[PDB]
Amino acid sequence: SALPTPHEIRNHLDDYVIGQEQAKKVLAVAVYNHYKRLRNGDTSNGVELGKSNILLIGPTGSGKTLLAETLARLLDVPFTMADATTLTEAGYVGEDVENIIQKLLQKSDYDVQKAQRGIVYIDEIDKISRKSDNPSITRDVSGEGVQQALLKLIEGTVAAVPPQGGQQEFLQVDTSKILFICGGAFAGLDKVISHRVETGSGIGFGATVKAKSDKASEGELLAQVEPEDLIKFGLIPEFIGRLPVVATLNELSEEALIQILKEPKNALTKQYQALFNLEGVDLEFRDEALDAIAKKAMARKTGARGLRSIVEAALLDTMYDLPSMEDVEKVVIDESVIDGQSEPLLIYG
Amino acid sequence: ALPTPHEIRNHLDDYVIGQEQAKKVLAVAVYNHYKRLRNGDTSNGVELGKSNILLIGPTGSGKTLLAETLARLLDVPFTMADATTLTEAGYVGEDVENIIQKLLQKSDYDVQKAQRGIVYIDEIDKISRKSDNPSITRDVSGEGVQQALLKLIEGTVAAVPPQQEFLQVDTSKILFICGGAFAGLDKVISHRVETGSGIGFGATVKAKSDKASEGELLAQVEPEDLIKFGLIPEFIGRLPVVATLNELSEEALIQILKEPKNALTKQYQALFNLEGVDLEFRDEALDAIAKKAMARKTGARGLRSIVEAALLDTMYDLPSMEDVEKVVIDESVIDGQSEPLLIYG
Ligand SMILES: Nc1ncnc2c1ncn2[C@@H]1O[C@H](COP(=O)(O)OP(=O)(O)OP(=O)(O)O)[C@@H](O)[C@H]1O
Ligand SMILES: Nc1ncnc2c1ncn2[C@@H]1O[C@H](COP(=O)(O)OP(=O)(O)OP(=O)(O)O)[C@@H](O)[C@H]1O
Ligand SMILES: [Mg+2]
C-alpha cells in the first residue's frame, strides 16, 4: 500500500551489491517514480507525466547485470531481462525487438494491463553500437538497425506481440509507460573522452607535451561522459535522446574487492564455503588472503569475475584430493597459499 | 462547421513551441482534408487530389509530438505507424497493409470513415536506402518498404483481413504524413550548396565559423539532396510538400520548460505534489538548463536529463525527510555547486 522509499530499495541492493552508490540511487529513484506513476495511473493532475529511461554504463564486472537481477526480487511490477545482441531488425532471421514484450507478458500471465506497467532491462546495449568507421553501404541490422527499431519502443508504440502461437488474434501492447534500463560495458569510450578533455598532443615547441602519468583512468573519464562521446562510439542521437538518465559505475578498487569476497549475500567466499560445507569440511578465508586475492584481480582487469579465477587456482589442488582424503574437518587458507609458497592447512580429526 | 487553420494552429501551440511551418502545413493540409470530407461526393467534374506531407527536423524538434496533438483535436480516424517495423510483402516483418488495418480498427470497421483519414508514419528516414546504388541484396526493410508504399501514398486498393474475405479499402483519399530526422542530410545539402571547397588560394575555406547551421541547411533541402541521402525518386513525388522543422534555440527551449500544457517543469512539479511536497522552478534556473541542453544536441529530450540529474539526490532522500513542505530550485543547483533549498513546514 505504501511505496517503499528509495533508501529502503538501496538497502536491499546493498545486500547483494557492494558500492556503486550513484547507480543505486538512480535505480531506486526510477522505481520510486515508476511506482508513483503507477499509483498515479489515473493522472490526478493536469499533465501526462512521462518516463525517464536509465542507461547503466560501466566497466565489465562492475555489477551492471547484478543490479538488474536484484531489482527483480524486490520489484512489484513485471520485470524482464534482454540481450541486445540477439535482437535484429525486422524482416531478418535474427530475433525481433517485439520479442522483448512477449517475454514480459509471460511474467505477467499475458496481462496487457500488467505488462503495460512493468520494467525491462537490455544488457549488452553497447554491442549494437553502430560501426561508425564502417561505411554506410550495408544495413547494420545487428547494430544501427536495432537502435532504429527501439526508438519508438522506448518513446511509445503499440507493439504487436504474438498471441501465444498462430495473421490474426495478434495482441496489441502499448509500450508507453514501460520503463527500460539499458546496460553495457562500453570498451574504448574512455579514449573518446580523453581526446575531448585531455586534448594533449603536438610535437613542436609551441605544443603541450603530456606525461603518461597525467593521463586519467577509465573510471575518471567515464564519469565525465557526455552524449557527444556516445555518438562517436556508435550510438545515434535518436537512441541516446530516449535515454536521458545516464549512470556510471566506477572501477572496483582493491578495498572494494575485499568486501566482495564476504559482504555480498552470495559473496564469492560464501559460495565456496557451502560447496565445502555440504561435503563435511569447513572453509575459512583469512583476512590477509583476501587482500592478496584482490590485488591479483586488480591486475587482471576483469572486474569481480577475476576473484573466482584466483580462488579456483588456489583451491584447485585442494578440491582434487580433499574429497578422497578422510578425517579432514577444516581447511585454512593463508596469504602464503595465494602467492604459492604454501598449501591450505588441513585440520584433521 | 469546419475549423479554420488558425484554430488548429492555436491548439498545436498549447503543446508545441517554435514551429510555424509545421503547424501551418499541418493546419492547411488538415483544413483541405476537412473540406474534401465535406464534399466527399465531389460532384464537380474536377477530381480534387491530395497532397501528402513530409516532416524533417532534428531530434527533440516535435515531429512525433505534432502527430499526437493532431489526433486529439481531429475528428476523422487517425493512426500512427513505424516505418522500421514495416517490410515488403511476403516476409515475416510487418506489411504496409497493416497500417490501414489499425486505421480501420480505430473507426470500428467503418470503411466510409477509413477512406477519409490521416496517417502519420514516423521514422521515415530509417527505411531510407543505405545507398542509391543498385540493391545487390534486396533491402527488405529499405527500398522494399518505399516501393510498397508507392501506391499506398499515391492511391490504390488495399486488402486487409476482415476482422479469406480480405476487405477492400481505397487509399486515394486517405492523407499520409511522414516524419524523420535524416541524420546526415545536412552534409548532402552542404556538398551541393557549397562548392569549390578545396586546397588553394582561389578555393573557399569557411573554417566552420561561417558554415551554415544544421537548421538552416535543412531549410534549403531539395529533392535531389534526398536522392543522395538515399530515397527512390518515385517516393519523393508522393510527398510534394516537405516541412522542415528548425532546431530549437536556447530561448525557445526556455519556453518549452513551462509553456506546454504537459511541460517538463509541470510534470516534475506535479510529481512532487503527488508525494506531498511543493516544487518551484525559478526563471533563472530555466536558462541554465537550456544552455546545457543545447550542448547535448539531443533536442528537448536533453532537458529531462538535466532536471533529473540535479534532482537525483533530492528525489532519493526527499521521501525520507520529514516536515519538508516546499523546494526552491535555484540556478546554482544546476551547475552542481549548491543543494536545492529545503523549506520545512
Ligand atoms: N559490486 C558488486 N557486488 C557484488 N558482486 C558483484 C559486484 N560487481 C560484480 N559482481 C559480480 O559480478 C558477477 C556478474 O557480472 P556483472 O553483472 O558484474 O557483469 P557486467 O558488467 O554486467 O558484464 P558485461 O561485461 O556483459 O557488461 C556476479 O558474480 C557478481 O557477484
Ligand atoms: N517544441 C517542443 N515543445 C515541447 N516538447 C517538445 C518539443 N520538441 C520535442 N518535445 C518533446 O519531444 C518528445 C516527443 O518526441 P519528438 O516528437 O520530439 O521526437 P523526434 O525528435 O521527432 O524523434 P525522432 O526524430 O528520433 O523520431 C515529447 O517529450 C515532447 O515533450
Ligand atoms: Mg552484463
Ligand SMILES: [Mg+2]
Ligand atoms: Mg520521432
